[PDB]
DNA sequence: CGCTTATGACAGCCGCG
DNA sequence: GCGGCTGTCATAAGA
């Protein structure tokens, strides 16, 4: 098979690499890699190497990486550019694997683990690791087995072996409901003492050294804990065996790095490739959201679970590891990482760095062309203008249609041809609004321009534009294979309804391309076995395409980040500013065009149809459009929705393309790529007193959407942005009551809203105290505390945390409030035994007794309702010109 | 090296018969 | 006592 690398490391003058050889077996090697860097030479010197600016360069081969680094140091002192890939690991990978690498995941050892550490005195700090490790569950992808290390005797108790029979039984039967699909994949290993467990674990680790190591929070807890525990008991020399190269290091805080291993903490792979931003990121919360089943439940505090119910303790450890494997089975984020890393030829963990990923992609691309990359330069962090957001007029908007530009920044780079080596010059910049209204002199009739004053060559392809354009082509390329493979999805599926009993074999065709009609019906006459393999193959294909297509998308959207980053090799302040300023002009330019077109077709004069714009989207009020045809002439909702849809497709879009076409010629851009697509269509139900939507201000609105990019909803979906209903700090009961308030406003009207509001006020005091409590995170708690009391400028939540501390000062059983975590908050009436206006206890749990009964007795309902429900509702209703309460004065809306 | 553009909940001034 | 400001802190998109 085709060889590929697993991990790579640089230690001194050697490159340590683990990899899969042609035979498919994992191997390791040390190589005295000789790097090459470059320097500018004279034109008279014959060479084949040129920097991206066309300047000639001489290749300097060094005897070892240390000499290369030394040379770079000398060049900086002399003041002359040192060109080439200074990260020798990338160079080595590029040189060793100069070809599209095909990898076989079944050969990559992926370890998923989790440990448990009983601790009476609070969270067991990894940097100390003062407590024994009493449980370890380590899943290995190659053996597809769950290895469980159980400590029977510890200073905290002696227990009996864990029972797999009891683990499989149901809850009602005293069991742990450990899934039957892993029950046979568990290898149990009990131990008499801790030293025997760690040493057996460490030995196990040497025999099955992980390539990719993941799990939940493993980088911040499990890995550092295991490392330090071993180091503290045995020597550091023993702890270093956790690294296949016996080499480790420490980073920010207590982040241990194990050379020869790629750590991909699943908690990070989630906060990166899932894009959903959950309120909480605990394995329990995430597991519920993705699998509709969280971690195993248990009674009492975790610090006492091992001694009170060791059976459940071990099963809990095994489930925690399985949940992560289940989520991955759904998100496939590990597979993605591998795919992206192998694509850019970087260490798998670098996938977390857009800068490193793009650096490697451009580097390998330029290498094939014999070009030499620029030297990374030092750049002062300098803030520059970003996206444009229009200030909306607070109000209700009955009918709205939004339009979004596709891949704005990446497109702008291509259109204007922005790149460091394509910079051609500058021009006198006029006020941005002069360009938006096309009253300013045309910037240049020779170069491609950006409203910030930069001019670019049109006669040459830029390094960046070209590189981004290639990923765009690979995108539609792969998204084209799984597109046709989808067509074959029915040619094979439906071929099972009325096939034949002819015993045959599965044909050899490429599902990437449409099935040839010369073999089309040839398949509609095979056995039940082959046909079930014909669709099986079509699955691998239609799925493989997804990963590639998704990876290309992630790269495309992360390019701008890198370009704005001073640590990026191709960074340039002018270029980053050219991108955002252009985007700012484009959005406002098109806003002007849409208004101009809609006024003309409506006979109106200087009317504002665009009510809001943000970055690459605009929202248009369609009331005039609807009235132009009369609202009473529509049969139902779907009727006017079909009308606006049609009007957008055959009237607005063409007018938009014409508008952007003009802007491209005005800035004399290299190529027109400003494409807008109708996004949403929103409005109230036909025949209702509802208000399709409203805006309170920037980033704050709600719309009753009926259609999104062509897909018509059976029922209108609320699209809410920025309002408290979207805030994790908003109490549960209130978050849903605020949503129902908005739904009623958009779909049913004022009266319905007032009816609900009244009922909710009446029944507020009957809601669970946990559902009506706001949530917040405890930060800098030690910055505003003065001996149990609040210091100067002490936040409200933090003030409540202290009130809790004091009230529980002297109890170790009651839940303590740690830092950086989330906590519930509740206001208290004046004259409470807590001597404060509020109290806050840890989240996810109920108020410990001894104070619970009192809290419920002193909690201020009035203030709670007013502060979390009424205040924000009034914000929505004021903007929407609605009253949530009868007999409300009209003058209250005026300033004095 | 794994940021902008924003809003809102509070705290703490200054000023005014 | 509140305005009308100036900070700190806490939170969402999208790239």
UniProtKB/Swiss-Prot annotation:
The keyword Nuclease applies. Its EC number is 2.7.7.7, 3.1.11.-. The keyword Nuclease applies. Belongs to the DNA polymerase type-B family. Mg(2+) 1 binds at residues 114, 116, 320. Residues 890-895 are annotated as: Interaction with the polymerase clamp. Mg(2+) 2 binds at residues 222, 320. Pfam families: DNA_pol_B, DNA_pol_B_exo1. Residues 698-701 are annotated as: Binding of DNA in B-conformation. Part of the replicase complex that includes the DNA polymerase, the polymerase clamp, the clamp loader complex, the single-stranded DNA binding protein, and the primase/helicase. Interacts with the polymerase clamp; this interaction constitutes the polymerase holoenzyme. The record marks 707 as: Essential for viral replication. One of its GO terms (biological process) is DNA-templated DNA replication. Changing residue 560 to A: Inserts both dCMP and dAMP opposite 8-oxoG rapidly and with equal efficiency. 100-fold increase of dAMP and dGMP when situated opposite guanidinohydantoin. Increased incorporation efficiency of correct dNMPs. Mg(2+) 4 binds at residues 404-405, 616. It catalyses: DNA(n) + a 2'-deoxyribonucleoside 5'-triphosphate = DNA(n+1) + diphosphate. Substrate binds at residues 407-409, 475, 553. This is DNA-directed DNA polymerase.
């Amino acid at each position: 098979m085709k060889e590929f690398y697993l991990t790579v490391e640089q230690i001194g003058d050697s490159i340590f690499e683990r990899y899969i050889d042609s035979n498919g077996r994992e191997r390791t090697r040390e190589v005295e890699y000789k790097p090459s860097l470059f320097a500018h030479c004279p034109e008279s010197q014959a060479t084949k190497y040129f920097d991206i600016y066309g300047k000639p360069c001489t290749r300097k081969l060094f005897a070892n990486m240390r000499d290369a680094s030394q040379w770079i140091k000398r060049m900086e002192d002399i003041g002359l550019e040192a060109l080439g890939m200074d990260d020798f690991k990338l160079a080595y990978l590029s040189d060793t694997y100069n070809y599209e690498i095909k990898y076989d995941h079944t050969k990559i050892r992926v370890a998923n683990f989790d440990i448990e550490v009983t601790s009476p005195d609070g969270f067991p700090e990894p940097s100390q690791a003062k407590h024994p490790i009493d449980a370890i569950t380590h899943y290995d992808s190659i053996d597809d087995r769950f290895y469980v290390f159980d400590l029977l005797n510890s200073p905290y108790g002696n227990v009996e072996e864990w029972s797999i029979e009891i683990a499989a039984k149901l809850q009602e039967q005293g069991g742990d409901e450990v899934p039957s699909e892993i029950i046979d994949k568990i290898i149990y290993m009990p131990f008499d003492n801790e030293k025997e467990l760690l040493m057996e674990y460490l030995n196990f680790w040497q025999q099955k050294t992980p390539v990719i190591l993941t799990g939940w929070n493993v980088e911040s807890f499990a890995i550092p804990y295991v490392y330090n525990r071993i180091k503290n008991i045995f020597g550091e020399s023993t702890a270093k065996r956790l690294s296949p190269h016996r080499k480790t290091r420490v980073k920010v805080g207590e982040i241990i790095t194990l050379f020869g291993i790629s750590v991909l903490d699943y908690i990070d792979l989630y906060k990166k490739f899932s894009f959903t931003n959950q309120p909480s990121y605990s394995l329990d919360y995430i597991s519920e959201f993705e699998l509709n089943v969280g971690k195993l439940k248990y009674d009492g505090p975790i610090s006492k679970l091992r001694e009170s119910n060791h059976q459940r303790y071990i099963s809990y450890n095994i489930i925690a590891v399985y949940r992560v494997l289940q989520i991955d089975a759904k998100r496939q984020f590990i597979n993605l990482s591998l795919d992206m890393g192998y694509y850019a030829k970087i260490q798998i963990q670098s996938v977390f760095s857009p800068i490193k990923t793009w650096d490697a992609i451009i580097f390998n691309s330029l290498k094939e062309q014999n070009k030499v990359i620029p030297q990374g330069r030092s750049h002062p962090v300098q803030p520059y203008p970003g996206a444009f957001v229009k200030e909306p007029i607070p109000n209700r908007y009955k009918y709205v249609m939004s339009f979004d530009l596709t891949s704005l920044y990446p497109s702008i780079i291509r259109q204007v041809n922005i790149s460091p080596e394509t910079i051609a010059g500058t021009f006198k910049v006029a006020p941005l609004h002069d360009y938006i209204n096309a009253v300013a002199e045309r910037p240049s009739d020779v170069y491609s321009c950006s409203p910030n004053g930069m001019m670019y060559y049109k006669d040459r392809d830029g390094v960046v534009p070209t590189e981004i354009t290639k990923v765009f082509n690979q995108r539609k390329e792969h998204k084209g294979y799984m597109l046709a493979a989808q067509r074959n999805g029915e040619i094979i599926k439906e071929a099972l309804h009325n096939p034949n009993l002819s015993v045959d074999e599965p044909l050899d065709v490429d599902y990437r391309f449409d099935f040839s009609d010369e073999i089309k019906e040839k398949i509609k006459k095979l056995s039940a076995k082959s046909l079930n393999e014909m669709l099986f193959r079509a699955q691998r294909t239609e799925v493989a395409g997804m990963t590639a297509q998704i990876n290309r998308k992630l790269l495309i959207n992360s390019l701008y980040g890198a370009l704005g980053n001073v640590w990026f090799r191709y960074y340039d302040l002018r270029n980053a500013t050219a991108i955002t300023t252009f985007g700012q002009m484009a959005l406002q330019w098109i806003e002007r065009k849409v208004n101009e077109y809609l006024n003309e077709v409506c006979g109106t004069e200087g009317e504002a149809f665009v009510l809001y714009g943000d970055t690459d989207s605009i929202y248009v009020s369609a009331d005039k459009i609807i009235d132009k045809v009369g609202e009473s002439k529509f049969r139902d909702t779907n009727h006017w929705v079909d009308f606006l849809d049609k009007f957008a497709r055959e009237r607005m879009e063409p007018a938009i393309d014409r508008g952007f076409r003009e802007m491209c010629e005005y800035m004399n851009n290299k190529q027109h790529l400003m494409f807008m697509d109708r996004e949403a269509i929103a409005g109230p139900p036909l025949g209702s007193k509802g208000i399709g939507g409203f805006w309170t201000g920037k980033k704050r609105y709600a719309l009753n959407v009926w259609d999104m990019e062509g897909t018509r909803y059976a029922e209108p979906k609320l699209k809410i942005m920025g309002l408290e209903t979207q805030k994790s700090s908003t109490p549960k009961a209130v978050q849903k009551a605020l949503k129902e308030c908005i739904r009623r406003m958009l779909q049913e009207g004022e009266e319905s809203l007032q009816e609900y509001f009244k009922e909710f006020e009446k029944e507020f005091r009957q809601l669970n105290y946990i559902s009506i409590a706001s949530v917040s995170s405890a930060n800098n708690i030690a910055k505003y505390d003065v001996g149990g009391f609040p210091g100067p400028k002490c936040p409200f939540h933090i003030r409540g945390i202290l009130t809790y501390n004091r009230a529980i000062k002297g109890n170790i059983d009651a839940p303590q409030v740690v830092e950086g975590e989330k906590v519930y908050v509740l206001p208290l009436r004046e004259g409470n035994p807590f001597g404060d206006k509020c109290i806050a206890w840890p989240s996810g749990t109920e108020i410990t007794d001894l104070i619970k009964d009192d809290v419920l007795h002193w909690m201020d309902y009035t203030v709670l309702l007013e502060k979390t429900f009424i205040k924000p509702l009034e914000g929505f209703t004021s903007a929407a010109k609605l009253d949530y309460e009868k007999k409300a004065s009209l003058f209250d809306m005026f300033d004095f």
